């Protein structure tokens, strides 16, 4: 079959917390980034809502090597 690094790979998320104001890392959200492959990027697929407190949706999207991605939902926790 047709198999790319996002087919290869499971990346798994976990709850990022961050102050209000502040963008926080989008790697924070990922549980397992050692069972990636090394320069694997992290990005956040949309601007994350952090100008007020709430927990917010936000998606971590993974750019393997190859320039596959993967995403992975997470809650991003904004506190004051
Ligand atoms: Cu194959
Ligand atoms: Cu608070
Ligand atoms: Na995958």
């Not at 079959?1 to 499971?10: E, G, I, L, P």
């Not at 971590?60 to 995403?71: A, L, N």
């Amino acid at each position: 079959s047709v198999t790319t690094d996002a087919d290869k790979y499971t990346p798994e998320g976990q709850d990022v917390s961050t102050k209000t104001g502040v963008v926080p890392n989008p790697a924070e959200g990922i549980k397992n980034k050692s069972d990636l492959p090394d320069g694997t990027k992290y990005t956040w697929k949309d601007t994350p809502d952090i100008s007020t407190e709430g927990n917010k949706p936000a998606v971590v999207v993974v750019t393997y090597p190859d320039g596959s991605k993967d995403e992975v939902p997470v809650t991003i926790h904004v506190t004051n």
